[PDB]
């Protein structure tokens, strides 16, 4: 009967707020630093959202004086011996509020300069619904954003800084609740504890933002390959194997519970990519996921001229701005060595090109991984000295990344005109 107490005593503080707030805010921290690669050193910075809300909202029109900006740009990226950051990860959930909109506007103001794509997640309060599962009911989010409720948001999608924000939808289950027959608490070598239950039913037992696995794939897409082509699709990047599902015996026979918050359909995968969101879609029953779309919050536009239309399609694509960013981490990092050496217009075009040259091809290699070694297709690098300043220059590169698959239509038909020898008149 002492078990009856413990099953009440401990279950009183595990269900308690504040206590399970740290759980959420550490389980999803453990999730990131689970892989441990050869050359991918993560790093923490525990800060309340409000302590940054006040920061950017006070220094939106003076970002260089922002305290955070002075702990990522001018601190490690700018300074000599400093080690620059790469792809920040916002563990927060951002709504459609006109306050949280600034939070992104500021963090992106940093990311844009520090060159570090800021990945985050968006709350279910965005689509104006109290249960994220009920987003499936919305037909097309494309027609949704036309609603005047998103006016402030559509303005932000037009900003340049938004080409570095990458917001994710859906939240993966990060902990299985405690049952004796399922996920038993590892008791002690004598203190019988394994017989210990929890208390949940519908949908309210710990979640974590998809942004984790998104970044935790960018890490993967670096130890294996070297660039960030390997974070999309099933066969290529985002697959995310083996997630923490859940099972429960209400009355039937252990009816499984999908690991993901929401079971996105096919046209949901797409109808979100246009809004500038990253859906974390699940394979029904398979207890797995995959990132089909990896788009920034930047507007895609349309345009009449075909070239212009294609430009905006690649810029919105996050996976490229991750790569183009890695060139900035090459320039402002390596060329710093020869800051005093005597060099020319024809010499800087050598050093900068001789490097990137090993990462540009046209031929395709078997398998995705063996080819994702080569992110770019071709590059131009036209540097040129400026008048007045003798020792100063001004470069201007332009990279065309290997355009990813994105979909296709198809019209099948019985022609009966292909082989006229069987249906023709002459016989």
């Amino acid at each position: 009967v002492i078990d009856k107490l413990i099953d009440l005593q401990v279950n009183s503080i595990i269900s308690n707020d504040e206590f399970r707030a740290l759980e959420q805010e550490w389980l999803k921290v453990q999730e990131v630093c689970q892989e441990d690669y050869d050359n991918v050193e993560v790093s923490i910075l525990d800060v309340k959202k409000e302590e940054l809300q006040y920061d950017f909202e006070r220094n939106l029109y003076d970002i260089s004086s922002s305290d955070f900006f002075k702990k990522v740009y001018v601190s490690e990226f700018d300074q000599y011996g400093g080690e620059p950051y790469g792809a920040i990860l916002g563990l927060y959930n951002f709504e459609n509020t006109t306050n949280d909109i600034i939070w992104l506007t500021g963090m992106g103001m940093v990311a844009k300069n520090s060159h570090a794509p800021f990945i985050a997640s968006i709350d279910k309060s965005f689509f104006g619904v109290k249960d994220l599962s009920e987003i499936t009911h919305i037909k097309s989010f494309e027609a949704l954003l036309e609603h005047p409720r998103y006016k402030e948001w559509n303005d932000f999608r037009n900003l340049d800084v938004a080409a570095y924000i990458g917001l994710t939808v859906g939240d993966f289950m990060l902990r299985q609740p405690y049952n004796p027959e399922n996920n038993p608490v590892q008791y002690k070598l004598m203190e019988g504890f394994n017989e210990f239950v929890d208390y949940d039913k519908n949908e309210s037992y710990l979640w974590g933002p998809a942004s984790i696995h998104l970044v935790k794939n960018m890490m993967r897409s670096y130890d294996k390959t070297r660039w960030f082509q390997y974070i999309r699709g099933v066969e290529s990047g985002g697959y995310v194997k083996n997630l923490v599902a859940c099972v429960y015996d209400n009355k039937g026979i252990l009816e499984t519970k999908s690991p993901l918050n929401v079971l996105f359909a096919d046209y949901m995968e797409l109808s979100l990519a246009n809004i500038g969101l990253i859906p974390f879609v699940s394979e029904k029953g398979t207890s797995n996921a995959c990132f089909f779309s990896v788009n920034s919050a930047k507007k895609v536009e349309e345009f009449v001229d075909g070239f212009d239309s294609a430009n905006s399609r690649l810029i919105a694509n996050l996976s490229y701005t991750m790569c183009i960013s890695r060139i900035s981490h090459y320039i402002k990092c390596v060329i710093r060595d020869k800051i005093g050496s005597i060099v020319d217009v024809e010499s800087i075009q050598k050093i900068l090109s001789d490097w990137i040259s090993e990462f540009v091809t046209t031929v395709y290699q078997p398998t995705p991984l063996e080819m994702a070694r080569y992110p770019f297709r071709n590059v131009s690098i036209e540097v040129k000295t400026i008048p007045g300043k003798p020792g100063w220059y001004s470069c201007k590169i332009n990279v065309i990344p290997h355009i990813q698959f994105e979909g296709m239509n198809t019209t099948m038909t019985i022609d009966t005109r292909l082989e006229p020898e069987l249906f023709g008149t002459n016989n």
Binding site: D7, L8, N11, S15, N16, Y199
Partner: peptide
């Protein structure tokens, strides 16, 4: 903020 869901949810 009255916890009439933590107290009502007694369970033995």
């Amino acid at each position: 903020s009255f916890a009439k869901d933590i107290e009502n949810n007694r369970n033995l």
